[PDB]
Nucleic acid binder design. Structure first.
Ligand SMILES: *[C@@H]1O[C@H](CO)[C@@H](O)[C@H](O)[C@H]1NC(C)=O
Ligand SMILES: [Zn+2]
Ligand SMILES: [Zn+2]
Ligand SMILES: [Zn+2]
Ligand SMILES: [Zn+2]
Lengths: 94, 109, 97, 79, 150, 60, 75, 60, 98, 80, 109, 94
DNA sequence: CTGGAGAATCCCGGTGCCGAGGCCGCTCAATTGGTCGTAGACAGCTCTAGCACCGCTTAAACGCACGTACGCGCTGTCCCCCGCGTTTTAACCGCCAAGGGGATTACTCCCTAGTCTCCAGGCACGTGTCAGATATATACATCCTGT
DNA sequence: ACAGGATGTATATATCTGACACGTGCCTGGAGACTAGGGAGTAATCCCCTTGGCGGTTAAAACGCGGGGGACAGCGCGTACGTGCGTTTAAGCGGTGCTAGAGCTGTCTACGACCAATTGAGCGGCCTCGGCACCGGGATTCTCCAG
């Protein structure tokens, strides 16, 4: 009965956000869960390493900025930073 | 009795769970303290990457005349894009197959 | 009777196998191999079917990549028939030996 | 005992076909079933080390995934 | 004319001079053609009537491929603009198309003045006033139009 | 008029030599290619998505 | 019933709608075939400010009518 | 030459505004529809076969 | 009468010489110019530490030496002794840098 | 600082090849050796400059370069 | 006035600083709690590895007929030994050079 | 005037112990310093990572032993684990 | 295949110096000694899942014949690279001069950890249906061999 | 190159079926409000290393020329590997049964975080000397060409 954590609901929401009339198999959902976990782990590890480098003690938006800039290549990095900054400004304005 | 609760994801206009990302950051023991905007930023990035890869996979599946994404479609979507391939250069996808290619030398002529 | 010139059946086999994604090794003998290898380290282990399936997937992916690289080597040598020389060259360049 | 032979010649041939080779020399089979044994040993050693650390007796899919991903060979679709 | 962006700016200015939309105007900067200055007359049928808003814009080299950046110079009160003047535009940040020109941008911002986007709370106070206190909202719009003349 | 009519609208620097199958528009191949590679899989004309197989070289 | 909706770049997009269809539904169709979210649209007919909660018949929109689709924008 | 270039070659009187999906040849509307109603899956340039789903309106 | 070695002997001699020493085989000042030019594209008016430049140069020489060992293996595999762009491309492709 | 790649000079490339253990060098090696070196330098300098501009400084440092190299899986010893 | 301070390295019969290792383990936020024997074991491992590599380097230097260990000797010691070569296959030693070897094909016949 | 920490003293002591009549240059000392730091980071990261995997919150001798078994290959690992177990047993005895 | 010539290499000796090595503060990091909350060891119960077995089907493996396409060796060539002398270039070294930016110190204040509450989004569980696989009759493209 | 027969291969239709997308109960983790304290953002200062310039030496790069050996094309031989057929074989599927142990829950105790006070050893500085690189000369060896 132990609760288990996954991103299936959100992956499905994004799927019907982008393609209104497309399904997704259970194995595909599992692969996407693994992919999201892996990317999260990579970015968090890089951000923690940056914080340790600069002798800081907190992971603010700048560390995630730079970690993304280091991981994602080129246009992916550009678009990701754009939308992430958009989101953070929207949040702080809210 | 306090106020109509609005989830942080909604406040930021994202579908990924900002609260869950924040909890994972705190529990994973990545740093002594975690900033306020870090979960928001990370959730936005994850949402973008997921949306991109899902869009490519859906395009591939539609081009294959099917309405249900599967690991084969995911593998094609990844390996046909140079940037996603570079990001995922060292990952194996179960039941993924390979891109269909043959070197020109082998083809008869 | 009808007879294909050598090579065309090979092309058809490549086309069919590069399109499907089933497993290309037999499950029971692969499992027996895995158990035989594992029994050296510690005795009388048990394996989850999912674990053995993951091992098959990883092994097939690794071997397929190795074969792409050794095919590139063989073509580099101005041939079409891969050889243990090609296999060892690929392994050495990828830093596995 | 002596179960490496389970990896049969036609199985190797179709693996290489998926790889994209036209014809295959006769000696490739021994070499490739040696390479596979080496790779299996390397992965299984780490998997067994993990499970033995966890006071378990059943190698687990998560254990195999961790072993593989320790070698820069991350595998998706098992956890 | 040295680059596609510069020639596009040339023809945009030519079209603005030849047939500018209703109640809008634009002018470059003497020292930087890439910098732009515009004055807009408030749209009819809205609280923003008789409004004289001053704008400033910045461009880059690959324009016919990216959206520029814009900001107000006069006082602003709008759910789609930040307090400093960071103006929130989809065709300018999310859904840009090369087909758009400066005149299209000006008309689009006039339309935004007409209708704030409900899910675009650049100013939470302005958004709340529009949603609930409509009367106070046009009162504030009239006040900002009043000091927009200076 | 004619040159403007049958030149690629978005750039208006060279000719119409590409078609977008999803909305059946006609732009120039290098515009299409750069927008694809910059991850704007989204038509300029009708603002609609597409893929790598929805646009092809056309001649007029 | 086909209707004409005009953009700001000389394009007219053809929408097949019905008089009873709401402005919100028209904007949703515009999202479907033009990728413009309904909250990111301002539809104007005969100089009138259309509202999502109203219908085409409310504003007296006839066949082959021209609607000026100028967006309400968010960056 | 612009009028002659842009008009379809089957008639040379009406403007070419249709494209055939598989072979990508520019022609007119009603000439192509009449030919297809005449059962002829025949292209005047490549002789490629087609079907009811192998054509559609295109506007420049 | 002039004395000329057979083509190859001095090549082997200088191979033996260079695999014995550990100096830095690229000219330091032009390498520094190249590094500064390359960094010009990411952040103008950048300053460098001499130690940083030396670290870059060391890493680059090590990388090129490894690449050339792999290229030589490729050329030997092709049944010849002269390395060529196709050999370099094969090495990089197999290693996964391309 | 325009067109300095020629600084990586022919005999220097030959010396590197000799250290690699090469007997004969074709005449076309030099162009793609320049290209490979340039690609490697961009790949490293981009990360180093990213680290630097995150740390809010105008001076690249040996530590930044070492971290960039370690990130690319080619850790370098002797610099800290 | 409690007792003579016997450092943990001396107590365990090692050379490396047990206290320093423990401090680094705590400060590195690798975990919220650190066991007592963990720094001891880690120091033992580090001391063993450094002793091994230094022994090999000293032997190489003596063979070269020098009384000082230098990057060249370290590089030779690391790469000549097979286990150490595998352990440190991805590192670059400054002023290291390479192992003197020539493919037999190149050598004249 | 900041004080920076290193392992030079301990490296020198072990060098003297193993070879009483050998010196070590400053650059070699720096290389050894970097090597020690690298191995420390590898082993400690692996141990903490195991601790996280097993839902544990305390790094212990067992985690360090498993980490070294995973990192060091073959006979090197066997000798290292023997030395580590001997050291911990002596420490607990004293 | 066997001997001189010459270049390169190797070996021994005197010498200067600058970096390794030993010694003296002293101050901060290690140590020692209680103290207390709790993470982890340990006992017990369960019921999930892996191991083991057996019978039947048949798909896949195994073995054999063949002939042909490709691997491999021998040969001619010519042109592209290597060795060498000479001239030109700029790297290198030493010195000097200016200052922009790295590194440290103090202060404050604004952000974030910690706590209690509650309520709604998300997870386990059910369920009907439509996407997908499969069987079959097509229509059409493709390979091989005679022409 | 052309044509036709044999063999794949694509296409439309009809069918079962089970994985999936929706719906429901409920429950615990995220949101809201509050407080307290310390991490770091900012300002000021010091001076260190970076940049820039200059001039003199000469070591290395650039250029040219001759020639020779090695990459490449060609040709011919043979052998071993793909193709297809007929005969095993054992994988695969189903069903059954048993039981180790993975997972969970409940207790309880050693044990590591934490604080305070004490001190000594490792860091910075500061001399001091010999290991080593170098320059000079003598002895040895590899390679080339003539014999
Ligand atoms: C993303 O953000 C960057 C950062 O300034 C900006 O230059 C770019 O225009 C943005 N792209 C968008 C909003 O698509
Ligand atoms: Zn264009
Ligand atoms: Zn379109
Ligand atoms: Zn026509
Ligand atoms: Zn045609």
């Amino acid at each position: 009965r132990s609760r288990k954590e996954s991103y299936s609901v959100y992956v499905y929401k994004v799927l019907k956000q982008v393609h209104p009339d497309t399904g997704i198999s259970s194995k595909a959902m599992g692969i996407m869960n693994s992919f999201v976990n892996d990317i999260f782990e990579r970015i968090a590890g890089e951000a923690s390493r940056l914080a340790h480098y600069n002798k800081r003690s907190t992971i603010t938006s700048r560390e995630i900025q730079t970690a993304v800039r280091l991981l994602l290549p080129g246009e992916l990095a550009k678009h990701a930073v754009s939308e992430g900054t958009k989101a953070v400004t929207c949040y702080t304005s809210a | 009795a306090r106020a109509k609760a609005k989830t942080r994801s909604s406040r930021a206009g994202l579908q990924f769970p900002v609260g869950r990302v924040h909890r994972l950051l705190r529990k994973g023991n990545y740093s002594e303290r975690v900033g306020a905007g870090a979960p928001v930023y990370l959730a936005a990035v994850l949402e973008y990457l997921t949306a991109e890869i899902l869009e490519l996979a859906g395009n591939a599946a539609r081009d294959n005349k099917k309405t249900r994404i599967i690991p084969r479609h995911l593998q094609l979507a990844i390996r046909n894009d140079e940037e996603l391939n570079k990001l995922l250069g060292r990952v194996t996808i179960a039941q993924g197959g390979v891109l269909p290619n043959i070197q020109a030398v082998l083809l008869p002529k | 009777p009808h007879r294909y010139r050598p090579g065309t059946v090979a092309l058809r086999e490549i086309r069919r196998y590069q399109k499907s994604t089933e497993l290309l090794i037999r499950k029971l003998p692969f499992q027996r191999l895995v158990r035989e290898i594992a029994q050296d380290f510690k005795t009388d282990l048990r394996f989850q079917s999912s674990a053995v399936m993951a091992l098959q997937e990883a092994s097939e992916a690794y071997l397929v990549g190795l074969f792409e690289d050794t095919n590139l080597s063989a073509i580099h040598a101005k041939r079409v028939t891969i050889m243990p020389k090609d296999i060892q060259l690929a392994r050495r360049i990828r830093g596995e030996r | 005992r002596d179960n490496i032979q389970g990896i049969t010649k036609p199985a190797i041939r179709r693996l290489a076909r998926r790889g994209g080779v036209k014809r295959i020399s006769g000696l490739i089979y021994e070499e490739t079933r040696g390479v596979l044994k080496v790779f299996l040993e390397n992965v299984i050693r780490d998997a067994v080390t993990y499970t033995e650390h966890a006071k378990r007796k059943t190698v687990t899919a998560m254990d195999v995934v961790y072993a593989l991903k320790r070698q820069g060979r991350t595998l998706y679709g098992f956890g | 004319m040295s680059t596609p962006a510069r020639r596009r700016l040339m023809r945009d200015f030519k079209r603005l001079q030849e047939d500018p939309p209703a109640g809008v105007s634009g002018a470059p900067s003497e020292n930087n053609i890439m910098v732009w200055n515009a004055v807009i007359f408030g749209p009819e049928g809205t609280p923003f009537e008789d409004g004289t808003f001053k704008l400033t814009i910045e461009f880059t080299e690959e324009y016919p491929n990216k959206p520029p950046t814009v900001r107000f110079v006069s006082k602003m009160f709008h759910p789609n603009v930040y307090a400093d003047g960071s103006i929130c535009l989809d065709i300018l940040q999310n859904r840009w198309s090369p087909t758009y020109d400066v005149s299209s941008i000006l008309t689009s911002i006039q339309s935004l003045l007409d209708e704030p986007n409900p899910n675009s709370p650049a100013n939470s106070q302005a958004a709340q006033l529009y949603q609930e206190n409509k009367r106070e909202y046009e009162k504030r719009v009239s006040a900002i139009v009043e000091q927009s003349w200076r | 008029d004619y040159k403007a009519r049958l030149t690629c609208p978005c750039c208006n620097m060279r000719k119409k030599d590409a078609v977008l199958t999803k909305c059946f528009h006609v732009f120039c191949f290098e515009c299409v290619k750069t927008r694809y590679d910059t991850r704007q899989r989204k038509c300029p004309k009708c603002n609609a998505a597409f893929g790598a197989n929805d646009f092809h070289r056309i001649y007029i | 019933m086909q209707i004409f909706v005009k953009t700001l770049t000389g394009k007219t997009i053809t929408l097949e709608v019905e008089p009873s269809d709401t402005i919100e539904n028209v904007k949703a169709k515009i999202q479907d075939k033009e990728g413009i979210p309904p909250d990111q649209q301002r539809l104007i007919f005969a100089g009138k400010q259309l509202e999502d909660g109203r219908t085409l018949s409310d504003y007296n929109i006839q066949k082959e009518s021209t609607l000026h689709l100028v967006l309400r924008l968010r960056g």
